[PDB]
């Protein structure tokens, strides 16, 4: 749950000389004393209970373990990692609303992928290198990077479709009846139809609009993989 995580750090006190048959450890108070504590500024203290443990199987083991339950104050990281990550992620969908004539789809999608990968590496450098669980932020960034790679492939295909002319490609009848008649109706596009080259351009634009919807429902549903964190 980084950076909204809560840590449970313990301090175990024992006598490394005498066993339970020589000295018995007792707790003066059930919790650690904060009578002279200086607030951290990054970490919030929740509970400092103290428990005396014995081992029923050994009878020579005794210790006192203080569980330090601390809660991170998340404003710093919420400002320095999450907001930039969300801003970068919001650009994943624009490539599908970018006209293919501009010749900048590759730049936009590749830059988005670069930024997401850099943020993922930074997050990997901030958290311990343990393989027990994955930060929800890291998982969400990974899923976004996969989506952006898929978008790069789709943009390559759409650019290939867009730059087609009747002198180099022939449009099959099924392509016509699908992309120029049926699919546009579902997406509320209603080709003006007021010459073959411009049909190819429209077909390429139809594919973009279709994927703009898919990358919006999924991205919006991507809140399910992010809203759970806070």
């Amino acid at each position, epitope marked *: 749950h980084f950076p909204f995580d809560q840590q*449970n750090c313990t301090m175990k006190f024992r006598s490394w000389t005498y066993d339970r048959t020589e000295i018995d450890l007792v707790l003066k*108070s*059930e*919790v*650690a*004393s*904060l*009578d002279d*504590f200086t*607030p951290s500024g990054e970490w*919030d*203290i*929740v*509970a*400092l*209970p103290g428990r005396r443990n014995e081992n029923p199987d050994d009878s020579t083991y005794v210790d006192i373990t203080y569980d330090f*339950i601390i809660r991170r104050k998340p404003l710093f990281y919420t400002i320095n990692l999450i907001i930039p990550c969300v801003l970068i992620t919001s650009l994943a969908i624009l490539v599908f609303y970018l006209p293919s004539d501009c010749g900048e789809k590759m730049t936009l999608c590749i830059s988005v992928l670069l930024a997401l990968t850099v943020f993922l590496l930074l997050i990997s450098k901030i958290v311990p290198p343990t393989s027990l669980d994955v930060p929800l932020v890291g998982k969400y960034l990974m899923f976004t990077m996969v989506l952006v790679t898929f978008s790069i492939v789709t943009s390559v295909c759409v650019l290939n479709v867009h730059h087609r002319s009747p002198t180099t490609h022939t449009m099959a009848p099924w392509v016509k009846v699908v992309f120029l008649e049926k699919l546009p109706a579902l997406l509320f596009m209603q080709q003006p139809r007021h010459s073959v080259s411009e049909d190819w351009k429209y077909v390429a634009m139809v594919i973009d609009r279709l994927f703009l919807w898919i990358f919006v429902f999924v991205c919006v549903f991507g809140t399910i993989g992010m809203f759970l964190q806070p």
Partner: antibody, heavy 118, light 113 residues
Framework: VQLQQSGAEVMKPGASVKISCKGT????????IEWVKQRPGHGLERIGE????????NYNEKFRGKATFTADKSSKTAYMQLSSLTSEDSAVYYC????????????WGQGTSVTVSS | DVLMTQTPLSLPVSLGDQASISCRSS???????????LEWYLQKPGQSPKLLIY???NRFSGVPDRFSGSGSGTDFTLKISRVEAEDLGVYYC?????????FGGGTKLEIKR
């Protein structure tokens, strides 16, 4: 263990009160002090909490801004201040000893009765 | 916040008759530590509430054995085997898991005759 609260307070509308909860017989600075409001009608509502050792405080959305917690360590007392008193703020307020994820609200104050009226 | 609801608002039951109070949660209050922090507080009229049950089942030291809590997930019940006069009062739930910590609606137990 024992938590002692201040006596009943009567204040005019628009004033501000300061209720004091004093705890003895345990490590005061290491236990949260839950403040609970109980309207005469019905319902226990948690106002917020404070950890006297540090300065951390949480306020429920309903009471945010209405209540302010200040904790004095020298004298084992924690104070709640209510701002802009009104009619519906008249109720009995309790202070309790809580440690999250551990020992529950086992000990409570005797209850301070606050009434707002001109 | 986690909205806590209790039913019934009133549960009339004659002396010596078993009673059951229901406690539902807006969302699961189970915690990563392996325990769920639900508590039951009884408030006799004109007195501060007294803790009865914490962590669903565990009984606060010094309470009559007749009290017994149970449940899991978002359904918890507090059972009283043989009620008496001293069992009159209002029972409140309390979730100690998800900050901020909120109280239940409150269940006014009465006796039927």
């Amino acid at each position: 263990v024992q938590l002692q609260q201040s006596g009943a307070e009567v204040m005019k509308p628009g004033a501000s009160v300061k209720i004091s909860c004093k705890g003895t017989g345990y490590t005061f600075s290491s236990y949260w002090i839950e403040w609970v409001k109980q309207r005469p009608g019905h319902g226990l509502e948690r106002i917020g909490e404070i950890l006297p050792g540090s300065g951390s405080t949480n306020y429920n959305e309903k009471f945010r801004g209405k209540a302010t917690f200040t904790a004095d360590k020298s004298s084992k007392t924690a104070y709640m201040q209510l701002s802009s008193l009104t009619s519906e703020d008249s109720a009995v307020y309790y202070c309790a000893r809580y440690l999250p994820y551990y020992y529950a609200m086992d000990y409570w104050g005797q209850g301070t009765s606050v009434t707002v009226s001109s | 916040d986690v909205l806590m609801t209790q039913t019934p608002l009133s549960l009339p039951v004659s002396l010596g008759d078993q009673a059951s109070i229901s406690c539902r949660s807006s969302q699961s209050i189970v915690h990563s530590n392996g325990n769920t922090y639900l508590e039951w507080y009884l408030q006799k009229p004109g007195q501060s509430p007294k803790l009865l049950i914490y962590k669903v089942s565990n009984r606060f030291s010094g309470v009559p054995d007749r009290f017994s809590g149970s449940g899991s997930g978002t359904d918890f019940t507090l059972k009283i085997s043989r009620v008496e006069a001293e069992d009159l009062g209002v029972y409140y739930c309390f979730q100690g898991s998800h900050v901020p910590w909120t109280f239940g609606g409150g269940t006014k137990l009465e006796i039927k005759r």
